[PDB]
């Protein structure tokens, strides 16, 4: 007669894309639409019990989250879990919910190992996955003749969820799975100046197609040093793995988009450096349902959550929680519609998997593995104005690169530089 | 009026040094000795509640173990936890028990990160630690002039607890913490023949002081290939990181000790190869209390556990569970003796820490960090007979290398070869 949804997310800390101050109202929106739909669970009153994934210091915890999962499981016996979004929170909760035979839904947890559904059974990911970033990088190399060597530099803050590590792991494993080219990798520490001579040396010794997962300022400083050392777009290309567009403003206003602009008198130098730089991000959803969702999300979060949802790519995480929830409610109704129950975890999950769906994020496809296909944009600068704009788009379901607004990929030599230099790297 | 001890160990699988078929009777011995002592918890009837750390397949689990921990915690509210011994079981349970403010005791969990007691608070390790292996390797290098470079090769079986990884991690981090020499490392897969050309090439390119953590047969095959390729004790030394002496028989009988012997017609070749090879193991306890303990352990396990405890270094793990338990019971009795309670986790733990104790394993010292100092033996072959015997012993508390039975370390050149070759590695 009613459905119990257990939530394990950051209830107090509002810094995460999957924080409750932002996912909560998007879930409220999805529940309110379930009510207004007589074709989605008619009569059931879907209730929600919350559990915080964060520890005493307020960051997402490999301990608070699985404890919260056990506490909600015995106190309310839910039929589905929502979250966590942090990798180290989601991995133990995922293994618990797999053992409990309870489906798990999250728009976070993008790490490679969550993809092993043999272990994380009944885990359905409706947000991005880092293997999908490897799909995009694969298609990018195939469409640009780079079939030999790439270099990946990544850095994390000690004690975080290691987002750049997992980003690089997904890219690394999938790209070598599909292309079998040599992917060199090097970890650094952003605040440690000793690493920058080492990085610049490895940049000019280990690759010419160079991916960097770092903060905007680290990526900027690395570019400044690369120009100062004579590394230009004729030989090198530096992709910034900035999936949430942290180095960019929102796609709503703030025209134009300048990541090299900082106001430290280095901006003129940074722009010439950034001529060799391109930014890989998630794709902003186009459909008008998304913009209307943003308006209602902003209203409802400022209302019943005392939080101000600003514009940006991070809002695709609450939008995907929303969409995943509706995708789940429909699957339950279909299972009920054939004699099943709300606890038929495997039946419900398989109705969700290998399935296309229409939600506020537009067309979203769950693959055979239970993971949402992820679309990516490629940003490039206009050599006239210097501002960055989308020039390439990747459809994760079809794995096709489509040019955007008749733009071209800027190259100082007229075509992309080779992934291997003239007479070897020496 | 009674003490509740929660146990999370392998209750059914009897393959682990910390399996219950082996730890259970050692703990029953320790409890029966608490009864017979009027100075240890007089009147308290110490009860035990068990929980299996193993999953459905019967191997120790990062999921079954923390679930078992939560289940014993709410069902019995114990005052102390015993186990797990596996790293991936012990890390989540450790974080739970730290959060619950309940002391944790184990002779397993030797990984580097368990030593961060800031996180794994009130975790006391009474068995070996892999950082202690690094102390031994440090002392070995200081006493032999190797102060430049070493190479570490290690391999694991996919899906195990990664024992060789954690062994190498402890050796690597502690040794570079104290010597700051270049420690090269390489992982391989024992069953994959592709790696053996790669290893042999790295052996003669990355080091001459070479530590290998692998199975006996892999270490043996690696030695045979090193002789076949002309790598002898005049230039190279190969340490086998075989801490449980899997490549050797027990110290009780089976005279003499021949790890190169296999019965495949390669034994004559293997002996010449093994002239360059020395084996690092835990030290067999000497004291006669240990031998009497072994007799009572064998009797009690064959009695109330239907298990046959054979001789070997692995028995120091149940012996240390036994000793740690008594060390804990005394600490509780001391806490009770000053008005404390059995739940003063911090008070009890600090009485146990930075403290020497006399147990069936003889003299055992808990360091300031809560970890038992670990003694190591170094096995070498007699060039006359070819059999291996202890020639060096490392006291972990005093960090001293003492020669054993007036033996000398065998060197084909009369002294150890340099950790760096003649005119560089080229």
């Amino acid at each position: 007669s009613d459905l119990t949804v257990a939530v394990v997310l950051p209830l107090t800390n509002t810094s995460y894309p999957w924080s409750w101050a932002r996912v909560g109202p998007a879930v409220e929106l999805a529940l309110a639409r379930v009510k207004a739909r007589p074709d989605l669970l008619p009569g059931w009153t879907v209730r929600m019990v919350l559990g915080s994934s964060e520890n005493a210091a307020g960051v997402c915890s490999d301990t608070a989250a699985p404890l919260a999962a056990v506490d909600l499981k015995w106190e309310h016996s839910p039929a589905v879990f929502l979250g966590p979004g942090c990798v180290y929170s989601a991995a133990p909760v995922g293994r618990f919910t797999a053992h409990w035979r309870v489906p798990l839904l999250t728009a976070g947890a993008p790490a490679l190992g969550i993809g092993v559904k043999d272990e994380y059974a009944l885990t359905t990911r409706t947000g991005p996955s880092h293997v999908k970033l490897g799909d995009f990088v694969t298609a990018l190399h195939r469409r640009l003749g780079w079939e030999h060597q790439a270099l990946v530099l990544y850095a994390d803050r000690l004690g975080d969820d290691r987002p750049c590590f997992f980003i690089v792991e997904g890219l690394y494993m999938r790209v070598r799975e599909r292309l079998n080219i040599t992917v060199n990798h090097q970890e650094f520490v952003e605040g440690d100046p000793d690493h920058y001579p080492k990085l610049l040396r490895a940049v000019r010794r280990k690759g010419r197609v160079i991916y960097i997962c770092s903060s905007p300022d680290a990526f900027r400083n690395l570019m400044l040093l690369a120009l100062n050392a004579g590394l230009t777009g004729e030989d090198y290309v530096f992709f910034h793995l900035d999936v949430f567009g942290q180095s960019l403003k929102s796609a709503q206003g703030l025209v134009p988009q300048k990541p090299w602009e900082r106001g430290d008198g280095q901006d003129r130098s940074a722009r010439q450096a950034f001529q060799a730089a391109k930014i890989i991000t998630y794709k902003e959803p186009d459909n008008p349902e998304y913009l209307e969702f943003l308006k209602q999300l902003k209203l409802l979060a400022d209302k019943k959550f005392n939080f101000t949802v600003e514009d940006g790519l991070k809002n695709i995480i609450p939008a995907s929680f929303h969409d995943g929830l509706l995708l789940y409610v429909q699957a339950v109704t279909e299972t009920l519609a054939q004699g099943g129950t709300v606890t038929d975890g495997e039946n419900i999950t398989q109705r969700m998997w290998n399935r296309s769906f229409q939600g506020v994020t537009g067309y979203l496809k769950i693959d055979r593995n239970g993971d949402r296909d992820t679309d990516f944009s490629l940003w490039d600068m206009d050599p006239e104005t210097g501002a960055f704009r989308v020039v390439l788009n990747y459809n994760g379901t079809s794995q096709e690169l489509m040019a955007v607004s008749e733009h071209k990929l800027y190259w100082p030599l007229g075509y992309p530089p080779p992934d291997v230099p003239k007479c070897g790297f020496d | 009026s009674d003490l509740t001890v929660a146990v999370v160990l392998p209750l059914t699988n009897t393959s682990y040094p910390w399996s219950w078929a082996r730890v259970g009777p050692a703990v029953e011995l320790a409890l029966a000795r608490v009864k017979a002592r009027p100075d240890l918890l007089p009147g308290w009837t110490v009860r035990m509640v068990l929980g299996s750390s193993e999953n459905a397949a019967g191997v120790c689990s990062d999921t079954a173990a923390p679930l078992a921990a939560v289940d014993l915690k709410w069902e019995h509210s114990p005052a102390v936890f015993l186990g797990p011994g596996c790293v991936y079981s012990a890390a989540p349970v450790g974080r739970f028990t730290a959060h619950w403010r309940v002391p944790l005791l184990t002779a397993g969990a030797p990984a580097l990160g368990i030593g961060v007691k800031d996180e794994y608070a009130l975790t006391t390790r009474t068995g070996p630690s892999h950082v202690k292996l690094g102390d031994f390797v440090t002392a070995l290098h200081r006493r032999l002039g190797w102060e430049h470079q070493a190479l570490v090769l290690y391999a694991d079986r996919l899906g195990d607890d990664r024992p060789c990884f954690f062994i190498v991690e402890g050796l690597y981090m502690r040794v570079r913490e104290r010597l700051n020499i270049t420690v090269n490392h390489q992982e391989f897969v024992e069953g994959d023949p592709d790696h053996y050309p790669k290893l042999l090439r790295a052996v003669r390119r990355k080091g001459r002081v070479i530590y290998i953590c692998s199975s006996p047969d892999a270490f043996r095959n690696l030695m045979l290939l090193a002789l076949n390729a002309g790598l002898t004790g005049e230039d190279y030394v190969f340490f086998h990181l075989d801490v449980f002496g899997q490549s050797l028989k027990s110290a009780q009988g089976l005279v003499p000790q021949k790890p190169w012997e296999r019965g495949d017609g390669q034994d004559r070749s293997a002996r010449q190869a093994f002239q360059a090879a020395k084996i690092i193991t835990y030290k067999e306890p000497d004291n006669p209390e240990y031998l009497e303990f072994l007799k009572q352990l064998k009797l009690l396990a064959d009695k109330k556990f239907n298990f046959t405890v054979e001789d070997g270094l692995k028995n120091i793990i149940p012996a240390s569970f036994h000793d740690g338990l008594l060390l804990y019971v005394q600490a509780v009795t001391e806490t009770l003796a000053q008005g404390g309670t059995v739940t003063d986790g911090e008070n009890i733990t600090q009485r146990m820490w930075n403290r020497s104790f006399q147990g069936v394993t003889g003299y055992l010292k808990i360091d300031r960090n809560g970890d038992r100092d670990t003694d190591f033996s170094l096995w070498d072959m007699d060039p006359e007979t070819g059999a291996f015997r202890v020639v060096l012993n490392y006291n972990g508390t005093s960090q001293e290398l003492m020669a054993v039975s007036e033996h000398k370390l065998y060197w084909p050149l009369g002294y150890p070869p340099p950790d760096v070759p003649k005119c560089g590695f080229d």
């Binding site: 490999d62 990798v87 180290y88 991995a91 790490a111 490679l112 190992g113 969550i114 290691r162 590590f165 690089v168 792991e169 690394y172 494993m173 060199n184 990798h185 090097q186 970890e187 650094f188 520490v189 440690d192 000793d194 690493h195 080492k198 | 990062d62 790293v87 991936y88 890390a91 989540p92 990984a111 580097l112 990160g113 368990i114 961060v116 996919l158 990664r162 990884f165 190498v168 991690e169 690597y172 981090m173 490392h185 390489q186 992982e187 897969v189």
Partner: peptide, 25 residues
């Protein structure tokens, strides 16, 4: 498989890298 990537998701396995190419640790 990989020497650096694919090895579980517990902070216990990220205390040194040791398979990885890192300047820290």
């Amino acid at each position: 498989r990989s020497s650096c990537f694919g090895g579980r998701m517990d902070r216990i396995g990220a205390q040194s890298g040791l398979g990885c190419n890192s300047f820290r640790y």
